[PDB]
Design a protein around this ligand. Structure first.
Ligand code: HAS
Ligand code: HEM
Ligand SMILES: CCCCCCCCCO[C@@H]1O[C@H](CO)[C@@H](O)[C@H](O)[C@H]1O
Ligand SMILES: CCCCCCCCCO[C@@H]1O[C@H](CO)[C@@H](O)[C@H](O)[C@H]1O
Ligand SMILES: CCCCCCCCCO[C@@H]1O[C@H](CO)[C@@H](O)[C@H](O)[C@H]1O
Ligand code: CUA
Ligand SMILES: [Cu+2]
Lengths: 33, 544, 166
């Protein structure tokens, strides 16, 4: 609880969103090469 | 006693008025990306509008350039003044407001007269009317007065407090303004050396590549110029509005210091698709761009921790219980928070664009706009709308009714929802290669493949028109209606033993400034020296 | 409560930072990868190659459309393209599949975009300068060219076509 757990979740979602968009476009990239 | 309030209010109102006018074109643009041509209608309402593009120029200039700058001049001058309880030099402050107002009026004329349909980036050879460039230049030079005014405030406070660390909000404002000064040089150089003498008829041509290079020198940091006023409020005031405290003074300072150091030397990331610019330099700017993303990643945590702390403090239940515990009853609190949520997908989109080669997938497609509306049109604009429910009461004395409270609260959710919906329609249409800055509804069978994302765009178009309308209502409502003596909602800060050391290191503003300038010279100097050594001006055109 | 939470915040801050930098470097590596690979072809040549926009369609590689396509080596081909308000020359552009196409693009008027739908070709075309991009279409068919850079009232209807012969 007292641990930044709430904040950790936030930067986790953030990290996942960055990962999806990124690798995702990276895929589209090679699919267009 | 507090003459800074009037001036601040004038910057704010003028900014919101620019927001209203500029955004009028927004809905029609969303419908346009929804393949629905509503411009014949728009023209019946606004007979001066000659085209989709004139409408778009007004949209970008009034929202992304005028409204944002005015909001920053208001916030980044008034908050430090209040924190220091010192009066800004009012002669300069009013002079700065008049330059903005006059520059604005002078640029408006040509724009509204269809004499400068070149978009907010105004890339040569597209050649606009001299009053457009002249007015834009004066509008922007207005910030140089604001810079002097804040450094003057800081200077005066230091003198009276030798050996003391610069207060938080003022530390943010000083590095912010020093950063903007360094950032503005690219555009000021583009205007003074080419655009002005060109539109005035003293020269026949301008080199397109050096023009875009000087433009983007300012082009990237200007969005940080747009963002930071919102970050100042999210770090120093929202924690209190949230019912908690700013968990860390030092980290807030660090975020702002990294912005001073990294906002300017990354411009080539808007030129990945440009010829004549070395690929190595593009990679360097790409790396530096990923670095400037760090301050925001850090901000993501410091702010979230502050909201979590405030949640758990007021009944915060479980792992996500602190969320529902927040003041979702106050629009002042809701606006910025919803904005931060959307800022998440917004940021990922940004890290993608900064990845050099990956940019070729999305460059110039409907994707860029989808991405940036989550940034400036959402996080920034929502934070500004939210200030209506606290900064205005502070500046006028007039409170917010339970009614006005419920309205603005409706305005904010619908605005945030409209942007999320639109972000879906634009990123998608962009992945489907639909071009940005295009009147596709005029070429109905041009993009069949994007029929579904277009539905989102039409939907978003409807939702946002409602939001805008409720907003215009709520705004004039809160001003013409009939706490002022209460200070600004500056939050309390949780200090630690480590703070002092870090803080004193970051307080060496003069040194960090030189480092920031050195970085800019190292990142742009080689390229610009090669450019000015092989200039090739070309003639202007008026293709509208 | 606050100090305890404060201690854990600066602590996790450093970790967060550590992770962020690392993640950013992975992205960097995945970018460097594309650079060494043959995909770095859609990257505009950095060498400055000036031309006069007012004479590009009267003297030089862009003047005669029939001369637009040129064989510059073994299975390689340079295609001088002209982007203007509001269209592309030649139109269509006919090139062999499996061949390395070195596009050399420029404009006689304003700035134009050169976005070949389905590909990674997306380059700004500046008057007075030549944009050099490389690409090997590995599949036959019709590749639409889209101008994705506002260039005047005829922007939304500015399209080209690259027929890759089968
Ligand atoms: C204010 C407005 C803007 C911001 C901020 C912004 C930030 C970035 N941008 Fe950008 N941008 C680019 C890269 C970036 C990067 C790397 C960042 C980064 O600074 C972004 C970092 C973001 C993050 C690291 C995310 C942090 C998330 C947070 C902070 C939310 C946390 C939430 C909390 C704490 C609350 C939780 C609450 C609960 C209840 C749980 C690139 C390329 O490298 C292009 C060129 C594209 C092209 O091809 O033309 C570009 C183009 C644009 C354009 C188009 C210009 C034009 O007309 O051509 C605009 C207007 C714009 C605006 C803005 N941009 N950008
Ligand atoms: C009612 C809300 C809004 C809607 C429906 C809206 C919609 C749109 C659409 C669909 C476009 C793309 C047009 C095109 O690519 O041809 C656009 C572009 C733009 N919008 Fe908005 N917008 C809104 C609010 C804002 C706000 C508040 C800002 C920033 C403060 C903003 C800044 C911009 C900018 C800078 C562009 C790009 C202009 C250019 O490329 O020349 N928008 N907007
Ligand atoms: C392009 C140069 C323009 C120079 C303009 C100089 C204006 C000097 C300040 O006038 C101010 O006007 C405000 C009302 O608008 C008053 O409230 C304020 O007390 C008064 O000081
Ligand atoms: C600060 C005040 C500046 C006033 C400038 C007044 C002169 C404007 C000159 O415009 C020029 O007019 C020519 C003839 O119409 C066009 O051929 C040319 O393209 C255009 O650039
Ligand atoms: C908004 C997030 C979800 C987006 C879902 C749709 C993504 C489609 C990406 O495919 C792209 O389609 C183009 C044609 O439209 C092709 O030319 C290109 O080669 C191909 O890579
Ligand atoms: Cu050419 Cu748009
Ligand atoms: Cu940028």
């Amino acid at each position: 609880e007292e641990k930044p757990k709430g904040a950790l979740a936030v930067i986790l979602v953030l990290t996942l969103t960055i990962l999806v968009f990124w690798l995702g476009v990276y895929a589209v990239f090679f699919a267009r090469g | 006693a507090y003459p800074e309030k009037k001036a601040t209010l004038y910057f704010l109102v003028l900014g919101f008025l620019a927001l209203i006018v500029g955004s009028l074109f927004g809905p029609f643009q969303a419908l346009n990306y929804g393949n629905v041509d509503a411009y014949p209608l728009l023209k019946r309402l606004l007979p001066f509008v000659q085209s989709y593009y004139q409408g778009l120029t007004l949209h970008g200039v009034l929202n992304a350039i005028v409204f944002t700058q005015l909001f920053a001049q208001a916030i980044m001058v008034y908050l430090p003044a209040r924190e220091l309880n010192m009066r800004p030099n009012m002669g300069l402050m009013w002079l700065s407001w008049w330059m903005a107002f006059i520059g604005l009026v002078v640029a408006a004329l040509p724009l509204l007269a269809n004499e400068a349909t070149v978009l907010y980036t105004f890339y040569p050879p597209l050649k606009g009317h001299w009053a457009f460039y002249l007015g834009a230049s004066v509008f922007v030079l207005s910030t140089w007065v604001s810079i002097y005014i804040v450094l003057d405030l800081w200077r005066r406070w230091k003198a009276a407090n030798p050996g003391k660390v610069t207060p938080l909000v003022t530390y943010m404002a000083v590095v912010f303004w020093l950063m903007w000064f360094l950032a503005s040089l690219g555009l000021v150089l583009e205007a003074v050396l080419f655009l002005l003498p060109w539109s005035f008829g003293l020269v026949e041509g301008v080199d397109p590549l050096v023009a875009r290079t000087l433009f983007w020198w300012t082009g990237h940091p200007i969005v940080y110029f747009w963002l930071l006023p919102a970050y100042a409020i999210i770090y120093t005031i929202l924690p209190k509005q949230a019912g908690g405290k700013l968990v860390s003074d030092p980290m807030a300072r660090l975020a702002f210091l990294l912005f001073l150091l990294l906002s300017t030397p990354v411009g080539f990331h808007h030129q990945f698709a440009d010829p004549g610019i070395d690929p190595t330099w593009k990679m360097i700017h790409s790396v530096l761009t990923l670095f400037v993303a760090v301050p925001s990643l850090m901000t993501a945590f410091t702010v979230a921790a502050s909201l979590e702390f405030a949640g758990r403090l007021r009944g915060g239940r479980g792992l996500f219980g602190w969320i529902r515990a927040l003041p979702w009853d106050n629009p002042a609190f809701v606006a910025p928070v919803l904005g931060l949520l959307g800022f998440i997908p917004g940021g990922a989109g940004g890290i993608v664009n900064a990845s050099f080669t990956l940019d070729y997938v999305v460059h110039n497609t409907a994707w860029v706009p989808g991405h940036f509306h989550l940034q400036v049109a959402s996080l920034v604009t929502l934070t500004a709308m939210g200030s209506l429910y606290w900064l205005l009461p502070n500046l006028t004395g007039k409170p917010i009714s339970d009614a006005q409270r419920r309205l603005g609260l409706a305005v904010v959710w619908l605005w945030f929802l409209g942007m999320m919906i639109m972000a879906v329609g634009l990123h998608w249409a962009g992945l489907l290669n639909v071009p940005r800055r295009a009147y596709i509804a005029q070429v109905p069978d041009a993009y069949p493949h994007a029929a579904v994302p277009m539905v989102f765009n039409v939907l978003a178009g409807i939702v946002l028109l409602v939001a805008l309308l409720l907003f215009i209502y709520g705004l004039f409502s809160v001003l013409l209606s009939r706490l002022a003596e209460a200070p600004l909602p500056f939050a309390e800060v949780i200090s630690g033993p480590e703070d002092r050391r870090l803080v004193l290191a970051m307080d060496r503003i003069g040194f960090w400034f030189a480092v920031a300038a050195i970085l800019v010279v190292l990142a742009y100097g080689p390229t610009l020296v090669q450019l000015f050594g092989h200039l090739n001006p070309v003639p202007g055109w008026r293709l509208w | 409560d606050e100090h305890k939470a404060h201690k854990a915040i600066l602590a996790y801050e450093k970790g967060w930072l550590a992770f962020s930098l690392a993640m950013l470097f992975v992205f960097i590596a995945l970018i460097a990868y594309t650079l060494a690979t043959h995909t770095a072809g859609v990257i505009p040549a950095g060498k400055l190659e000036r031309v006069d926009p007012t004479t590009v369609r009267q003297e030089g590689p862009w003047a005669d459309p029939a001369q637009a396509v040129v064989q510059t080596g073994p299975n390689q081909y340079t295609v001088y393209v002209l982007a203007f308000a509001f269209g592309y020359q030649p139109n269509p552009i006919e090139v062999p599949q499996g061949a390395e196409i070195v596009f050399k693009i420029t404009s006689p008027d304003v700035i134009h975009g050169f976005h070949v739908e389905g590909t990674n070709i997306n380059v700004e075309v500046l008057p007075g300068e030549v944009s050099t991009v490389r690409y090997t279409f590995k599949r036959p068919g019709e590749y639409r060219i889209i101008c994705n850079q506002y260039c005047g009232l005829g922007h939304q209807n500015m399209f080209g076509t690259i027929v890759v012969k089968e």
